[PDB]
Amino acid sequence: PFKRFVEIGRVALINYGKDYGRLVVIVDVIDQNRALVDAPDMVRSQMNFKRLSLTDIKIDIKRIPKKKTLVEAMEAADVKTKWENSSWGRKLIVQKRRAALNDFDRFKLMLAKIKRAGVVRQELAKLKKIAA
């Protein structure tokens, strides 16, 4: 039993190319290798499945819907909120945030991590002597 299928309404992540990190909706299927995808901020176009990673989100739309119909369907299902709140979608956001930290911000994060590690190690020691 497979968990994800290519179908009309499936939300997919572009895993390769310039559009990497963007969410698109499969609105029609051309052949085995290509699908017709549409997003609120892009023109409807075809792309190969080799550049797509299917997600668990799936909106309820008809084949090749209008942009207004597509936009409201995504908002109704909270596609953006679900993806960003999910662990998979948060990974992409965190990677961008880490790369965007300046020198001063990295120094602050170092101090927080160093202090966090020191306290955690002390807590573990108590859990060792007591809960041997």
């Binding site: 927080a112 966090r116 306290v119 807590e123 573990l124 859990l127």
Partner: protein, 205 residues
């Protein structure tokens, strides 16, 4: 293939389910760039085409011998580790000093003998069978091929590997329990660390 370019004292590669030729070409380039490589579990290397074709190829290799003096080569090594070593030798200018030094930086073993049993082992995606061989196509393990051409240590490696895996499972459970004991520690430390967690929150996965 230009090379990994990483700075490491030593690289330990687990060759399980790696394609022989693609693993050889990548490792040959790493060796030529001055990288020291250790390969373990060479008996689990995979060769495309199936056992029958690979067995026939090795039998043709066994035919080659200096008619007037067979001891003068070619030498037909049967063990999986030596077959991998000879495969890499064909991708290196081993008759030059530069090539000879590159080969001297390579170590190959069947199984995982000490001390490498307690050292992190990496994989090479460009040589992995799961990415390079389409499911349903014929392939054979180098250990299986070596046994049929005169390698008699397959059972010995198999028993030692089972013993190592069981010990690794016990060690894995100890770390698994230790991890469960550490999630409690951070929760207890949560009260003390109020400002610190706020800074790490946007960065935590």
């Amino acid at each position: 293939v230009s090379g990994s370019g990483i700075s490491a004292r030593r690289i330990v590669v687990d060759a399980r389910h790696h394609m022989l030729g693609r693993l050889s070409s990548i490792l040959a380039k790493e060796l030529l760039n001055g990288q020291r490589v250790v390969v373990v579990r060479c008996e689990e290397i995979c060769l495309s085409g199936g056992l029958v074709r690979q067995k026939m190829k090795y039998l043709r290799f066994l035919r080659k011998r200096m008619n007037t003096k067979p001891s003068h080569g070619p030498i037909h090594f049967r063990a999986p580790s030596k077959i991998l070593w000879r495969t890499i030798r064909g991708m290196i200018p081993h008759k030059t000093k530069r090539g000879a030094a590159a080969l001297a930086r390579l170590k190959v073993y069947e199984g995982v003998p000490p001390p490498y049993d307690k050292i992190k082992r990496m994989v090479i995606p460009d040589a992995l069978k799961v990415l390079r061989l389409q499911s349903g196509h014929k392939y054979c393990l180098l250990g299986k091929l070596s046994s049929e051409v005169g390698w008699n240590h397959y059972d010995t490696i198999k028993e030692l590997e089972n013993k190592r895996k069981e010990r690794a499972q016990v060690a894995y459970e100890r770390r698994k329990q230790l991890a469960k004991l550490r999630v409690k520690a951070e929760k207890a430390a949560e009260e003390k660390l109020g400002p610190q967690l706020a800074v790490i929150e946007p960065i935590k996965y």
